[PDB]
Amino acid sequence: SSLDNIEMAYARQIYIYNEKIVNGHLQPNLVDLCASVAELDDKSISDMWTMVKQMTDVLLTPATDALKNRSSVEVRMEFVRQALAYLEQSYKNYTLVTVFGNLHQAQLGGVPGTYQLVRSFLNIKLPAPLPGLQDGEVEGHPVWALIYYCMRCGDLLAASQVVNRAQHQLGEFKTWFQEYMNSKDRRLSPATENKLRLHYRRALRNNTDPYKRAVYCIIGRCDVTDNQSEVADKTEDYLWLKLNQVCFDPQDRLTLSQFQKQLLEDYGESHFTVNQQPFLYFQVLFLTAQFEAAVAFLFRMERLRCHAVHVALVLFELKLLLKSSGQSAQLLSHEPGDPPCLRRLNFVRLLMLYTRKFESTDPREALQYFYFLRDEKDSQGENMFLRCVSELVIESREFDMILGKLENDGSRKPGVIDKFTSDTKPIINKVASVAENKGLFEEAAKLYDLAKNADKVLELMNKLLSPVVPQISAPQSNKERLKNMALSIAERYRAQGISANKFVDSTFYLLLDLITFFDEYHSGHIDRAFDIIERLKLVPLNQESVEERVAAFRNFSDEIRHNLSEVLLATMNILFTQFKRDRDSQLRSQARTLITFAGMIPYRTSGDTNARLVQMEVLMN
């Protein structure tokens, strides 16, 4: 097996999600089905899916195009809020593990109020007082530190409580903050927003209290260039600092498009992967709505291929992933007729790479991933899922497992693909078609016979029999192994009343009779073998039938005319033997008949055959 522990667990989860859609059940939450395995690994992966769920848990317009949802200002706004809610809660967990040694340890004693937690967080991260703080303290801590880390944790209420106990010190900041907490989308009114920004810009552009600086332009979304590096030293603190500063419809203003493009264009992977920590960059791209970038990026880490494919599937089963129309493009690209700030993922290629790894010895699991390509076609019109099953069968040669083995008793035990579509007639011909083009007739027959395509089964069975008609049928020979399959196809084609056009069909049952004629001839059962050839009315034995038999030879399958030489000789040698054992006249007359027939028929080795036939007739007299 080519699948690692983690990859295998995901496969099982994707089998469920397929079993549900294959039986018409409720469309379960894919993101939940993937996070179910994440908990079996380190929390590096669990915290990823947590971000994936929260970033995709946005009210969408079902049955709407992918590009439309992702271009709409409506959806683009909720992404920023879902991310900020993740950066705030994520930071809140950092504040817990900073005070208590373990999340469990914090829980048993009880998570304290965000206010008392933050206070018990300031104790550690600033034990001694910084001399540059302003506006005094509140219950033993600087008022601005409390406000910042409370807003950072996302509890505006806890921050407003701090403000209520410092009404005299904070001046007019109270009426401004109380408006920020009330107004939605973390924005103030243009009039009041103007009043505070100008005040900050007036004489507080450079204040000795960094926490004061941070809060002001987090509330006013100002000084976008100043990264407030004094308080936002971590990467998440930067993302959170900026997403609280982005704006929507000219100076000192930043928008999501600029920010998202500004980040990866100027400070690409190189900047965010110098510490050899891959998820850091992924979180930067995913929490900025650049899902295709983050997916391709994370898909290149050979250790995190599994995770990047699935986060692509989630975005794909939620009409959020922007697929690349052309299949000839690179993995990541920007369509020419699209804005430059969005990118597109060649989803078809993405799955095709992941599959090649475990498609060789783990076919069942491969199909589960090929199903997501059911909705796509290629330039030639083939259904992508169907084509992927053809290529996977041509390579793996797993016919019984994937296509269903058709035993020699008339049964068709369904295969693994039967689960996904009930119309399995084309691919069985596709797989049968190539194997036919590769001279693998004995297989192409079994495959064509699996799809009950007798036109092709009998055609190929005619080719495999004609060479072996006069041969000696011996144990385990190529004659027995082909005759016995032909008879197993004759019964199942009569018991089920199946037949190809009379040309293909007539020749097929005719060869089977001839194969019996030589099997009796090679055994010495002369009398019995003579009777068979007489029924077939293939070789004339009375002079009257020569005219009609000669005309019939003209339109009989060349697989029959080929073996005419051996038939005449065996029949002659049959009469020849019976002569040495009135009757003499009758054999003599029949001997003549064979000669005149052979004389009027142009066929294989007519030279040596016509001569031998004449000699055997002379010895009779």
Binding site: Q13, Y17, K20, I21, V22, G24, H25, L26, Q27, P28, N29, L30, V31, L33, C34, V52, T56, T61, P62, A63, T64, A66, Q290, F291, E292, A293, A294, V295, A296, F297, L298, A308, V311, A312, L313, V314, L315, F316, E317, L318, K319, L321, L322, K323, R343, L345, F347, L351, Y371, F372, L373, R374, D375, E376, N383, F385, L386, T421, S422, D423
Partner: protein, 160 residues
């Protein structure tokens, strides 16, 4: 199948759709059902029979029933679609997954139809399943006009 849509029997249609559903061919399955519905009634005897209040004893009922068998099968397709992709994300690494694109491709075929009895049957279906999500988001008056007739009749419809 589409070339012989008008001749397809309920047994052959059902089996076909089911097989297509199993192979993740949702859009395709839906497109066949719509085509079959339109071919078994090109005069729209069904649309007029519904616009006339569905008078019992009338012989358009047959025409309406042959379309309802197609519409039901469409419900099964969409049902099995959300089921098969329950838990699957709509976006991975940024761009859309394959499970998402099949959802869009399927629902496209739905919103791309001009079969009116079909869209009525779908409004009723959305209401049934409880999807105030999508129905209140149509925009179209067609759905308003449809409700204006069915309002004085049912509480749930009047609320919509």
């Amino acid at each position: 199948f589409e070339q012989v849509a008008g001749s397809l029997t309920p047994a052959n249609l059902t089996t076909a759709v089911e097989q297509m559903i199993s192979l993740k061919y949702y859009a395709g399955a839906i497109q066949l059902c719509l085509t079959v519905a339109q071919q078994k009634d090109r005069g729209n005897t069904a649309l007029s029979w519904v616009n006339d209040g569905k008078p019992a004893n009338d012989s358009r009922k047959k025409a309406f029933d042959e379309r309802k068998i197609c519409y039901n099968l469409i419900h099964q397709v969409l049902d099995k679609l959300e089921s098969d992709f329950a838990g699957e994300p709509e976006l991975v690494d940024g761009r859309p997954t394959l499970a998402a694109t099949k959802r869009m491709e399927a629902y496209n075929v739905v919103n791309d139809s001009s079969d009116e009895v079909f869209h009525f049957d779908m409004y009723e279906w959305y209401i049934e399943k409880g999807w105030t999500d999508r129905i209140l988001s149509i925009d179209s008056p067609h759905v308003i006009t449809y409700l204006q007739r069915l309002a004085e009749t049912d509480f749930r419809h009047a609320e919509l």
